[PDB]
């Protein structure tokens, strides 16, 4: 009867669906992938993880099944279970699984795809986690590259990866290049305002700034940073007036 129990029926009918359709005609494994992705996030959040692993396992084996292969597809369902992974606090597995989705690119022609480069990001930070971080320096890089051959420089996806390449640097205390990476991310972030970046991401620029700065001895910029993320944040909640000629029915809140 509870909202995650509905939620599951749902995409499981939805899944099974692309199943059947996929058993009438097995070239759509495509939108089999996609309906499995949404029913194994929902197995995740109830901490079934070997659910969530056997879907995309057999999501899998049907793109290895096709007469014509897919690489695309298969680099790609390997990053959904590095995901996966990831979020299962299996760390080494998370960064094995990229890096197949990553060797099956390279060997066809996928080298500077979107798949790739949010591949590398991924795992950038996973080598993060495993404090490695000249192998976290090269794959940011890479991303940062690419996303900036596919995208504009002015795009989100390109201030992401410099956010992160940010944070890498901060973290392994190299402040100057830190702040280097914030503020390009500050910068292409400013100049993109609608649902194409939601404003959340701009205050954590200010916050990730303000340690940057702080870590600098520029405690005065730093101050005004940490306060333009507590604005962005604040101005988030939106002000709704009350005008009026009495007072409000009050609620016992007790």
């Not at 790609?76 to 690119?105: N, P, Q, V």
């Not at 000249?134 to 995208?151: K, N, P, V």
């Not at 730093?222 to 604040?234: L, M, S, T, W, Y």
């Amino acid at each position: 009867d509870t909202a995650l129990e509905r939620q599951i029926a749902s995409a499981s009918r939805s899944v099974e669906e692309a199943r059947r359709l996929a058993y009438h005609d097995p070239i759509r494994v495509g939108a089999l992938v996609e309906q499995i992705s949404v029913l194994a996030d929902l197995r995740q959040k109830e901490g079934d993880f070997r659910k969530a692993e056997s879907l995309y396992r057999e999501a899998l084996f049907r793109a290895q099944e096709l007469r014509k292969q897919d690489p695309d597809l298969l680099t790609g369902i390997y990053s959904l279970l590095a995901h996966l992974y990831d979020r299962w606090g299996r760390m080494d597995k998370a960064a094995e699984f990229y890096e197949l989705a990553l060797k099956i690119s390279a060997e066809n022609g996928l080298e500077e795809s979107d798949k790739v480069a949010t591949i590398k990001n991924n795992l950038a930070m996973i080598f993060k986690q495993l404090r490695k971080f000249e192998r976290a320096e090269g794959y940011y890089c890479e991303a940062l590259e690419t996303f900036q051959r596919l995208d504009g420089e002015q795009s989100a996806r390109v201030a992401s990866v410099y956010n992160n390449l940010g944070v890498l640097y901060y973290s392994h205390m190299d402040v100057d290049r830190a702040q280097v990476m914030h503020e390009r991310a500050l910068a292409i972030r400013q100049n993109l305002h609608e649902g194409q970046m939601d404003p959340a991401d701009l205050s954590q620029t200010f916050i990730n700034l303000g340690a940057v700065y702080k870590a600098a001895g520029d405690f005065q910029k730093a101050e005004a940073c940490v306060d333009r993320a507590k604005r962005i944040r604040a101005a988030m909640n939106g002000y709704h007036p009350n005008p009026r000629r009495s007072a409000s029915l009050l609620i016992d809140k007790s």
